[PDB]
């Protein structure tokens, strides 16, 4: 009868409430009522706590465990470092064989916008903004012709596409590269354009179809979380096969899967698979 984990044997002098059973204090209806309410909401509070620990995301749990791990008793001051180690490094590229030069982030003052670009990458042709010649015509969007660039470059089996560079466009690229619909991509901090590297497998492309959500800029489609949740469901089976890209109120470019995860609605951009 050896006992492990049970700490001093027979504990220490602790009787249960019911067993010891001191004479029950008679509280006025006030005392009793208040006891009932405070211990009721004490139980409510506990149930809440447990539900919150159950629903905690794994990343939160890991941060917590390794935060406690490093914890010291005094909250120590940060140590002075080299003049800086913390500049975000510039992504590597080759100067001699290039789509575009990788422009330093140290030059960030020199840069222009998508509309009025600063002179750079002179040796390369400059993509032009696509705008309507008349009223009845659709009003094009960088997303619209981003998708059609990629589609047509996929049909002609090209390795590289030069494509319009805007926030949600290179957002779309990062998402597609996440899902592996695209071999790679880079923004050279060129104002107009950036470049995408396409992937082919078994002789045809990795992209069946890629379509923009809207034909105009004058039309903006909003995706309810329940809609994005419908897409994921093929008659009872969970389907992540097709990807839908969207903006969030938070300016994030997300697929519909993460969107459904955090239950946020977003504005539609394009579908691809």
């Amino acid at each position: 009868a050896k006992v492990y984990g049970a700490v001093p044997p027979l504990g220490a002098a602790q009787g249960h409430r019911l067993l010891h059973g001191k004479r029950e204090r008679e509280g006025s209806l006030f005392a009793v009522a208040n006891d009932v309410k405070r211990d009721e909401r004490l139980l409510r509070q506990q149930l809440n706590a447990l539900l919150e620990e159950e629903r905690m995301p794994m990343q939160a749990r890991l941060q917590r465990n390794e935060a406690v791990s490093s914890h010291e008793a005094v909250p120590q001051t940060p140590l002075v470092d080299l003049p800086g180690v913390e500049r975000r490094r510039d992504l590597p590229a080759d100067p001699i064989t290039r789509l575009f030069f990788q422009h330093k982030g140290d030059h960030a003052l020199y840069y222009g916008t998508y509309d009025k670009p600063s002179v750079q990458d002179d040796d390369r042709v400059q993509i032009e903004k696509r705008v309507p010649r008349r009223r009845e015509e659709n009003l094009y969007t960088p997303i619209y012709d981003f998708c059609h660039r990629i589609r047509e470059a996929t049909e002609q089996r090209k390795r590289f596409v030069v494509v319009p560079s805007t926030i949600e466009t290179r957002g779309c690229a990062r998402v597609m590269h996440d899902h592996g619909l695209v071999a790679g991509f880079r923004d050279f901090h060129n104002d107009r354009a950036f470049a995408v590297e396409l992937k082919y497998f078994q002789g045809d492309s990795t992209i069946n179809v890629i379509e923009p959500c809207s034909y105009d800029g004058r039309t903006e489609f909003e995706w309810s979380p329940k809609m994005m949740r419908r897409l994921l469901n093929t008659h009872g089976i969970h389907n992540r096969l097709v990807v839908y890209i969207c903006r969030t109120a938070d300016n994030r470019i997300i697929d519909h899967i993460h969107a459904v995860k955090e239950n946020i609605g977003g504005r539609g951009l394009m579908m691809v698979h």
Partner: protein
Amino acid sequence: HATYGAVPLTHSQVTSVYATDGGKVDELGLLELVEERIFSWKLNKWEMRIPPNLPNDQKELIRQEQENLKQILSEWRKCFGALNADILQISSLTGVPKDVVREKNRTWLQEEVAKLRWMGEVNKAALLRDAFMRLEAFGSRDFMFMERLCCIYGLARQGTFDEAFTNYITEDPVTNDIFVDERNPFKELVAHIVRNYSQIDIIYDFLGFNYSEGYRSSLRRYMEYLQCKTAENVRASGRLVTGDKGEHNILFDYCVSRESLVSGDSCQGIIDFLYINGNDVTLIIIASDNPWLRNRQLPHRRQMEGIARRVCFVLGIPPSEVRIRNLLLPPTYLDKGSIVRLNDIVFRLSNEQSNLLIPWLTNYNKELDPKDVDYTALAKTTNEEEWLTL
């Protein structure tokens, strides 16, 4: 509270309003008494404090500095709360009086935790050790002495929370008699502050508590003071201060490098002060708050050649011995390092004449915040790169 007729106070009228002579003042007794009364406030106590009749912009300024005083004071409130909690916990586990706790050695701990461990109680041994170790770092009653005192001075400076500190109904010890405390500890402490610290407005600016137009003018008031106590004759002609000596002592207030930098004619070597001590020349620059616009700010070597030989022409100083140097100070406030190398090098002051002239430097502990460390280190840019980056 704020009423019709309330004015934001300047330093001179704060020195005038609270002027009272009395000898016995514990800085550390009073400071904590007033501190305690402010921690006793609820948030509504900050409500009506802005003065009723002012131009709207000025009102916005006062709102800003009030909100920063309140934010700093609460930020210190919770800190003090935790600290006091730890003192109370040590006094509970040991059985020592709550006064003495702060002055204990590590020896006393090695003994006490031996007792507590050998009494079989491990939990409160580790607990005690934690409490003591952080109480060692943050425990001194003087811990942040200067910024606290500047907080309270700021509060005087607004001339509104004045009467918030008195007239409370209070209980007692087991006597538990209800009376009305007519002592105003605030008025005491501020009077003490004015009587002791003459330059405290200068300090209050060095700590960045001037959010508009901050810490520039107080620097030149400071430098001008330093020079006046250093030399035997000082003429002040406009923005230029000179000696009657025939030997070179010269202080030039050139430009305000804050506005004149972003305003017009983008240039490199825009400076603030010029100081000529004899064969040494010093350019004193106050760093800009743009991390972009700092890289230019301190002069190109060609500009230093230029200034050197130009002084050589005008003052008649020998070009063989001239030493022209830069000093660039932190943008929004002023740390110990900067003041030491301002006192020691720019003006030549041996430790004893400085301690004589500036007593408060010993108590003044302010150092660079992590965010502001790198103002000194500047981007090195190539000559074929000049079209891209400033």
